[PDB]
Design a protein around this ligand. Sequence first.
Ligand SMILES: O=C(Nc1cccnc1)c1ccc(Cl)cc1Cl
Ligand SMILES: [Cl-]
Ligand SMILES: [Cl-]
Ligand SMILES: [Cl-]
Ligand SMILES: [Cl-]
Ligand SMILES: [Mn+2]
Length: 340
Amino acid sequence: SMTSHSWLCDGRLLCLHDPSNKNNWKIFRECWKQGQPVLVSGVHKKLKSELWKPEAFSQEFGDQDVDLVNCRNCAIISDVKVRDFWDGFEIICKRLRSEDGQPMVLKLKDWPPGEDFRDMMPTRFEDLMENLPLPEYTKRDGRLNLASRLPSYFVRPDLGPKMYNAYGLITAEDRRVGTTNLHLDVSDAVNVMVYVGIPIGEGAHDEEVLKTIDEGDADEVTKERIHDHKEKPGALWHIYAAKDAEKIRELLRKVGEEQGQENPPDHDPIHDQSWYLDQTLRKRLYEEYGVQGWAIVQFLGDAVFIPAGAPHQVHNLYSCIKVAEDFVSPEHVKHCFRLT
Ligand SMILES: O=C(Nc1cccnc1)c1ccc(Cl)cc1Cl
Ligand SMILES: [Cl-]
Ligand SMILES: [Cl-]
Ligand SMILES: [Cl-]
Ligand SMILES: [Cl-]
Ligand SMILES: [Mn+2]
């Protein structure tokens, strides 16, 4: 039967079922005040599905010049065309191949560039902003979004939204690699999964995808969502409470040293955006520092709410198109204050 919500992560993660329900705020706000992430499902049923397809981006913007990143080694592929990324998104025989002849796992860097999303893509901008959940928090002019209402004593987010466009990680060796490495944002954000591309020519490979989710420490109810309803899983997230950021720095300082890195004792390994916490490092963080995370599988149409200051990392299971909007809730405004 239809219900307002359910729980993931053994009761530690709220999952809201109706993205446009006028009463979502009554359930959301207590979890949000405690510093928890929140998941909202069903957002892709509210969008214009034809706007959010890799073939459309290629047809409309393919002649633009861009840089790509190789997810396996962080190398930059300079001055190629936007079509060189989009045309290999789902069809593996069309992907750029490395010097070993393997198809590469690529990310589109800074596209659209800076704050140009709204000017370049006005129909997509309207379709996203009118269908974001928790609109008093997430709309540019929402009554609980302080972004437009704060003086320069507060760090204000850039004008959004921002896209996260990257291929799926494939191999056993890729299991320990990040799509986006561990980092934090001083503003709150909502990240929406608007398209999942599953290759059928040499993809749609549950086997290595099921071992990744298992080893990723996904909960039993998340593991039922794969086998039962057949929704399309996009990406594996690990999110940590803002209050645990310094203990994570203490762990990565120690591991850096053990690995023969040469770093001052106050150096910030989260700000460096150089680390991915694999199964070994996540087990050490829990056992040695007492720090537990949220392991979240983001399916098509899932919106992930990421608290200001909360360290997070993402590992794409398949090729993903994600769009995110920043906001400043009153619950977390301390994270962007420039004094004490
Ligand atoms: O040309 C290349 N790779 C290729 C060609 C045809 C089929 N598979 C792979 C290539 C790619 C990258 C670099 Cl830095 C050097 C070369 Cl030489
Ligand atoms: Cl558009
Ligand atoms: Cl709201
Ligand atoms: Cl990264
Ligand atoms: Cl907080
Ligand atoms: Mn982020």
